[PDB]
Design a protein around this ligand. Structure first.
Ligand SMILES: Nc1nc2nccnc2c(=O)[nH]1
Ligand SMILES: Nc1nc2nccnc2c(=O)[nH]1
Ligand SMILES: Nc1nc2nccnc2c(=O)[nH]1
Ligand SMILES: Nc1nc2nccnc2c(=O)[nH]1
Lengths: 115, 115, 115, 115
């Protein structure tokens, strides 16, 4: 009678990267903000989803791959994260462009439920 | 065993518009803040719900139509957005009046689940 | 194939009131913050849950009744709000004490689903 | 036709404690932020989940036990809180390390649903 959902959270991860499908955006890196939640039900004893690796992988994939659409980044990153942590039962990833519009915050996300 | 929910997000979209059912409010434009989430399961290849158009449409409809109740704006905007993006499975739209009361933030929303 | 949930929202409604079960707290009014969401499926034509009345009623009940526990306020206010707006399908009300502890924000809430 | 979920909330509880599995982190206390939601359906008359005790217990367990992984703290604290308040139907606890990385906020959580 007990359902336990563990999460690891990396929120407001901010760094600069080439990202975008419009030519003007790809001239120089721009500031983005990433939120990631990884959920699971059980790991091995003393095992953990290391937030250090997780943050470094997200930056590594974005900065090197220089994705076009945010949706392209979400597709690749989510598949990479699930392959690396097969135990996860749910993934939520949102990528926001902080400065692309002065009057709003825009972004795209993916929520994946694995059964 | 995999359910994927993609989202496009325009948050804290701030602009001035005529809005309101009380006569005093309609004399001059007032500052509002709009949050929109559009969710879907699949688009065509390299297709995307362009946050640029989405933001411009919301401003265009509010500024030109000069809605009375927030609920009138929500009714019209949601129907417009779904007609324009029939693929969406869920829409969340919230419109807030930033300055109408000095001691709170008031607003109205609509969450629509399409099956 | 369409489920529409309308909401009216009063967030971060801040005012001073007598509130508390500890004697020291009831000597003078203290600063609180109230969040209220009222959800419904349908109203009459051109009818609306007026956020003006809603905000004024919450302040009126808190300031006059000088509740003991936050839970006492939530019990009374929720019953009052549902009786006044029988059409609501869901109510969420959270009351927070802003200054009662310098190192956290504490509060209590009620979520009510009506069927 | 009425389902009522009461909550007690301690949010952004900030204090310093020894916490961490990396040797450098355990040399000195670091700033953390804790969010706790406790939900229930019914208590006795005039009974309440005292946010004062709750906040003090969380600080007491963290500062004295000097947990290794955040997940170790979550495991212990959640079991302690449920044992102390058997009436709870749902617990959400998130612990975040405020300064461990300058470019993000990292943390871990547990959501437990009791039936
Ligand atoms: N959804 C979406 N819309 C966009 N519009 C303009 C530029 N980039 C994008 C993008 O990356 N995603
Ligand atoms: N729900 C709601 N209440 C209101 N009250 C006053 C003014 N406008 C409004 C409005 O636009 N919506
Ligand atoms: N849950 C709860 N706990 C409290 N603890 C101390 C003071 N007041 C309260 C109160 O109003 N509610
Ligand atoms: N999930 C997780 N990852 C970590 N990585 C580094 C250091 N501590 C931790 C920790 O406490 N939890």
């Amino acid at each position: 009678g007990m359902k336990t959902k563990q999460g690891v959270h990396v929120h407001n991860l901010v760094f600069e990267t080439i990202l975008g499908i419009l030519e003007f955006e790809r001239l120089k890196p721009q500031k983005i903000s990433v939120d990631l939640d990884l959920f699971y039900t059980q790991l091995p004893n003393k095992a953990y989803l290391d937030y250090i690796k997780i943050q470094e992988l997200i930056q590594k994939m974005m900065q090197e791959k220089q994705y076009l659409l945010i949706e392209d980044a979400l597709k690749d990153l989510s598949q990479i994260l699930k392959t690396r942590y097969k135990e996860i039962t749910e993934l939520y990833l949102k990528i926001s462009k902080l400065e692309i519009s002065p009057d709003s915050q825009v972004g795209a996300s993916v929520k994946i439920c694995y059964e």
